[PDB]
Amino acid sequence: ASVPGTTTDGMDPGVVATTSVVTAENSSASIATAGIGGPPQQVDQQETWRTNFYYNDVFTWSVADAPGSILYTVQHSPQNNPFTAVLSQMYAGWAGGMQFRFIVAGSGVFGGRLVAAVIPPGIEIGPGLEVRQFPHVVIDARSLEPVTITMPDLRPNMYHPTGDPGLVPTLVLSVYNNLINPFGGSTSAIQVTVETRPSEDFEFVMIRAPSSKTVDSISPAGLLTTPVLTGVGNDNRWNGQIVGLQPVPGGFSTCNRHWNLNGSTYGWSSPR
Amino acid sequence: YTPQPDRIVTTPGTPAAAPVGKNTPIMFASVVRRTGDVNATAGSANGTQYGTGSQPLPVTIGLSLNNYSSALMPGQFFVWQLTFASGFMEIGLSVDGYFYAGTGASTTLIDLTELIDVRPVGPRPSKSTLVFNLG
Amino acid sequence: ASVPGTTTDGMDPGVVATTSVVTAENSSASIATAGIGGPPQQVDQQETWRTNFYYNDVFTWSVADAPGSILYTVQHSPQNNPFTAVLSQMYAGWAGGMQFRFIVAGSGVFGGRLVAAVIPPGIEIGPGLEVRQFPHVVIDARSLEPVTITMPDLRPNMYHPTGDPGLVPTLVLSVYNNLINPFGGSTSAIQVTVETRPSEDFEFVMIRAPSSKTVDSISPAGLLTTPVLTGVGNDNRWNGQIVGLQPVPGGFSTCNRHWNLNGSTYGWSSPRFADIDHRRGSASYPGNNATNVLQFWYANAGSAIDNPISQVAPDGFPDMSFVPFNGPGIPAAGWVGFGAIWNSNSGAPNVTTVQAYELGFATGAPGNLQPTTNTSGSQTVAKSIYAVVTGTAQNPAGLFVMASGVISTPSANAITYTPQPDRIVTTPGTPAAAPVGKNTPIMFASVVRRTGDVNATAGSANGTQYGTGSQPLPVTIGLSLNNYSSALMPGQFFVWQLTFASGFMEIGLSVDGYFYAGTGASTTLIDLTELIDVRPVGPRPSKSTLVFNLG
Amino acid sequence: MDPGVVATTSVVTAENSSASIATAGIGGPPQQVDQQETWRTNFYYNDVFTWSVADAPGSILYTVQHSPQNNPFTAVLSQMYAGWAGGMQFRFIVAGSGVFGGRLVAAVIPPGIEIGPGLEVRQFPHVVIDARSLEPVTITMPDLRPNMYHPTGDPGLVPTLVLSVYNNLINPFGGSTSAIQVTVETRPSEDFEFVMIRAPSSKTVDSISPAGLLTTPVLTGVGNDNRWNGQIVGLQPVPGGFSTCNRHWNLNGSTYGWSSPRFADIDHRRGSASYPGNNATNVLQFWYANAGSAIDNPISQVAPDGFPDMSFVPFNGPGIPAAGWVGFGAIWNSNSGAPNVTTVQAYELGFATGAPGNLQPTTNTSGSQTVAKSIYAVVTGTAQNPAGLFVMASGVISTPSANAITYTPQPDRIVTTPGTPAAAPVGKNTPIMFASVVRRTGDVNATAGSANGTQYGTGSQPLPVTIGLSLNNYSSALMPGQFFVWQLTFASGFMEIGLSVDGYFYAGTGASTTLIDLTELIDVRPVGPRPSKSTLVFNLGG
Amino acid sequence: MDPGVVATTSVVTAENSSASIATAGIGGPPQQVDQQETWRTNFYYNDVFTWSVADAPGSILYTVQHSPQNNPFTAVLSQMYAGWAGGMQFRFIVAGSGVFGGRLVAAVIPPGIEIGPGLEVRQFPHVVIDARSLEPVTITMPDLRPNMYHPTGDPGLVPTLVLSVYNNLINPFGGSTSAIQVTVETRPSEDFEFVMIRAPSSKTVDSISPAGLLTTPVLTGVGNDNRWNGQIVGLQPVPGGFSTCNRHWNLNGSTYGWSSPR
Amino acid sequence: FADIDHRRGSASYPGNNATNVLQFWYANAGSAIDNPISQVAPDGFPDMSFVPFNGPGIPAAGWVGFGAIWNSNSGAPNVTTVQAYELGFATGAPGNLQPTTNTSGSQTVAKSIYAVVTGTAQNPAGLFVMASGVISTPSANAIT
């Protein structure tokens, strides 16, 4: 009695594609050296946030992208999942893997393949990075079942602290083979959606008070929120409603009332 | 817009916002009234006047209280997703504090009146094209 | 034995996809809870109204819909199934889940996925809602077998009263991935049909009289039928038959006889074409001779003490900005009317001055008369367009103007529809119609006589003048009494289906009282001559584009 | 004991229940058969009929056929089922009194029998219902059919239930109370079932029997007349009768007259114009045409659309005429008409004979001529032979001084076309006429307060009723000889209002000419058809 | 038979009694549930309403909500209990006469329905009450609620009991007597229970509906006017009307005039 | 904290000479059709009662902001009538100036506190005043 591949459950991983970085000794070492933070917390395997896949990002794959061109890049972090980012406000450290589910919304008439490799930490990410010379999994554009890969937690640290996570692996989806629409025309692009889920060895180690360093001090996610860019936030020059974005093709250099990510300024004005 | 990059007073020592690939620096526009026309607001028949700033005021307020040194290594963007009524587009934040969106050599002002959802996606490399399509 | 999958029975679900909320002990905690209404009514899992899937709503899925764009969202209600909606007027409360079966009309050459999530009842649904971060399933556009998604009854209440259900879960089926049609050409959309069958735990509890009134604002499907368009039914500014709809690109704002979903008006002028009467206001005339002059009446905006709705204008005074004119040349458009002057203190109207007067709102009377845009800080004005041999100059004076109006045109050939969107006055604090997506606001035209030509007939001898109004008067009459605050969820519109002789056009009605159509950037008047019948569809969100299949 | 408890109860079956269920399997399984449902174990209201003392023993009061519209919940279930079979239980509740006496017959007539005066119900298998009975009498209607099931929309031959007088109603008092009300309550029997589910879009009964068209606000809110667009504040009876045919629509899809139901405009193109006096300064313009020259009106040729159907009053000189119909308007020349600037005035229109000499009022439209004379002075007067009028549709009443003349029109001034049905008082019932407060020329500020009684203008029937009747055909929706009756409930009383096959409205006031105010009126309610011999109730607040 | 004997009796339950008691355990054990108590096995006076001949058939005479203030002993028990659940039994006693006639409708309106002129009670599951009836007609009000229990002070959605005219009252005499009195008697049902005991200092109804302010001695003893401080000996009617605004206080906390009450 | 902007507010100057005159601007409340929330007053208007003051006398505990008057036919502000204008509510503008609290029947009344050469007497004129305000004090000593 069957389920049509066309439709997938949220708990359904699809086809589990393995990679040479994903091993048993890596997982056993991950748990054995994550135990220094204490017992594993939020480890109950029947929770809704641990079994279901939740949306991370979507991206466009077109026929104008050469092979080796990187389309999608995710750093290993608990901010990828929307539920481990909420559980990280009350825990002082995290350790373990994460699973990424890819759904390629192509038909049988398309051609070309994606590639998927887990970059070890310490490697620069950008153009000239040859994904296809890593341990990799190819993904066809005519794939119907979703394909999933596990990101192993390849760390030099024992655990990752919440404020400073340290060095983390990176997952890249680049063009393995050029997408080819045999037809010819303006309708030459497809979309691939990434859903993320914590693995079986993902855990948080020690608890901490949420009145500690808050979400405005560990990541700048709350600096740009929804009402700020619509009718609340003002510029740092004129005190007016931000109603547009003006691109500068030649570049500029603003010194006064401009703060970097190091909490410093080169100007002469307080932030008001 | 008045704050043209050819006339901005800058102390010696600040980093420069340079275009990285197809990504280009952006500056946050706002309607600023003039001494040529008091009643000139957005959509005026006399012509709207735009005042542009480098960062939003809540962003530079929150940047002056906290430190994100262990959040973005040099050469990485922090990217938010801005979805509109028609399309969606992405802006990114550098280490120096400048905002980067990928439009290439285009200088058209973004309308920004149909913005509905602003959400973050996390750290991304600097030499990657942020997706921009208003339709 | 063997079905191929191309043919599915009405009792056939196909593939069943439960996301994370269809649990057995949830159904057990819902069945034992709903006994507070007594024995469960209409529970028998052999009846043909609850074992077969039935049509609820069909909707299109174009290639222009971005991921996350809302295609089809319904709340948990008996109205999602036709026989359950029939028994909903028979019963007085319900509890239990419902099965939603989706059929995708797509070939194997299409591509793209459709997400489907069950929203918990406490979540406000609007622009900032992200659907794909909920427990969901995806449905491909190449789905041959139908997919059923059972929406359970998650509720903080015991049972759901039909009058006040409180908090109900919501099924949202939005775009997961862009539908691709790798072929170019005219084919850029497919269709998805939603079938609905009540679940194994659906039940009704109490009886009530057939269709007894209820706290739940009734669905506004009865205030707009077919005759309204091709028969009786008049306008808001004038009393004429609606001969067509015209789309205005940019928007407009009318706040005279306009009532919102929540029964309220922002302005004067109760919905009835009676007459215009005032008592306080001054009359004056130019010229040293009191013979063959033009009378000049004005009062300030706020002396309408007898008006029980708002003080800013007398009842029936039109919302037309004044066109300033001087001399024997008659003005271009405006609101004239056959009327007279009258004095106060038990005074009857004067015999020798009955004439056509044009009315309006001015600023700076009686000097440099200027047109007025805002109602606040203004003054109402009225002056004759023809010659009358007498003038009165008493400080207490008033008008008597018939309520039906016409448009004064100097040469009167083709002209322009009146009033324009730049000529309608507005009270402060008005809501403004804006074009959302490809949907533009529309405005209903009618045939109105002119002072230059008495024969303003729709035939030969010059094109006609189309007088335009905001919403029809039977809609305002039926909506000035009832309250529809909970009938339609804000951010969507109640869409109907007009059926012409060679096509169809969908018309939506928002929460502001305005009407929307997906004509696009066109100013072409659409003629209602071949319109046959009107069938209601129901709630549909603003991201969906209405069809414009015209012959 | 019929409470809201768990309850044992007893759902009484029918005599042919074993063969009703078995042969109704041709539609498949029986649907909505479950004996614990609370729509099947309770009696619900079906109809009320009036049993008066003036009825013969054996005269039929209440007749109804076997149908699922006899129950409020089987009729609700009937839109989603294309076929039904099974019996029904009827309960009769009498209002009655201890001092009243007389019996009734309830019996089930088998199919193939005519129902009328010749039918003798007392020899059928029946039950007897007293007037003074406390416990309501229950009868069961078996489903005696020549078919296997009754499809909705064409049910075939059905049994009939007939209520006849066994002994005539006696009141030992005398007058005052001379009628009683009996309530029929209807419950499905044991063998009642539905078969063969259908889409609810399919509908059979589309004639409410003129019902949903007259709701309550129509009278305590919106609602206008047929003469002016005035708000309805009163009903006033007239004894003797009246005739109206302008915007008066009968129960079929027809009318006898002009003037489509809309207050837009009056426009006529061809007709002669004149003015008296040798001086063409400060005169009264007089326009005339004959009856039958209206080519542009597609309904009737006798008048332009919107012309008032009143008789012209003969007046001359500077005196303002009493009563009448005036409206603001102007005269326009032909040949791509642009009107003359120097003539816009109030004009009194109407019907005369012998224009422009000795003007006499007219009663019949045949042999008459339409006239239009100004009441106020105008500085120019034309006399061109092709000329027309353009008069607004809403009108006011011209008056010499203030005070209050009478309600206008009187029943004798109203013009009729040949072939018009006349209102006649039948029994103690008498026709009514809907009143509205209208503005006048002697006093513009005719607010309903002090400074004499305000002027009342009366039309025939409400406009909502004219609009909702024009489209639909009701040739069988009301059985001739009866009227459809609504039940108005005030704050301190109630009244029954009827509606015949001719569009007229009736109330049982008798010989009284007093206006009845809908100030304290709250709600109306449909009842159904009821015969003309029954007097409508007049338990008002007085 | 309702005497002061040992008695067998019959305390008639409700249709949803199995689910009313079980879900009311969220407040703990059920309190004041004992079927031999004499405040639960007898009918007591609740309200009287006048049914006149000048009322339309279907006009609402008596409307009341499901509440423990409908019984004189559950309202007494209500000050020491912060929550109740369960049904109630209503009995209607008509004064009537043999010469009077006409029926009434008693039915339980489910929650979520407006109560007024548009409501049609005759198509509800109901009981019929004659004017000339000897034995009083009993209806049971089930506790149909969207909550588990009704806390006192904010009971939520409750069913409503509506008395409407089935057939209008007729008097074949003429004038004189043109109204009748109907007495409503109220008894708790089988599943009625209290939960979650509270201090009696807590109070909900503090407006007597202007009641305890006018007692009897106010008129046959102490009591003064608003103009002079004179003892009240009479009431005198006036036809046509009058206006007083000096020490005349309306039902809100306001007046239109001077002269504080002293 | 945005600027105060109002169209068609009456402006005048007392006397006949236009040397060291004090600029007077007033507009009735309920006529400022500029906000989507209410028409009682323009945006950024302080909720302060006007303390009356004449001649060369600095007012006290008052909301003074830097402002100018523009012609409504063009929108261009006038050159010389840029001063620190007291912003508040008053009851009677052409006669004696008195403070007020209620908005019904009061009027938005603005007046400069230092001497301005000449001044616009145009009746449909408009008033612009910047967002933030400083304190009008007769002396250098602080108050409550």
From Swiss-Prot, chain E:
Top-level taxon of origin: Viruses
Cellular localisation: Virion; Host cytoplasm
Coiled coil: none
General function of this protein: Capsid protein VP60 self assembles to form an icosahedral capsid with a T=3 symmetry, about 35 nm in diameter, and consisting of 180 capsid proteins. A smaller form of capsid with a diameter of 23 nm might be capsid proteins assembled as icosahedron with T=1 symmetry. The capsid encapsulate VP2 proteins and genomic or subgenomic RNA. Attaches virion to target cells by binding histo-blood group antigens, inducing endocytosis of the viral particle. Acidification of the endosome induces conformational change of capsid protein thereby injecting virus genomic RNA into host cytoplasm.
Subunit field text: Homomultimer. Interacts with host type II histo-blood group structures antigens at the surface of target cells.
Protein name (Swiss-Prot/TrEMBL): Capsid protein VP60
Organism name: Rabbit hemorrhagic disease virus (strain AST89) (Ra/LV/RHDV/AST89/1989/SP)
Positions spanned in the full protein: 1795 to 2056 of 2344
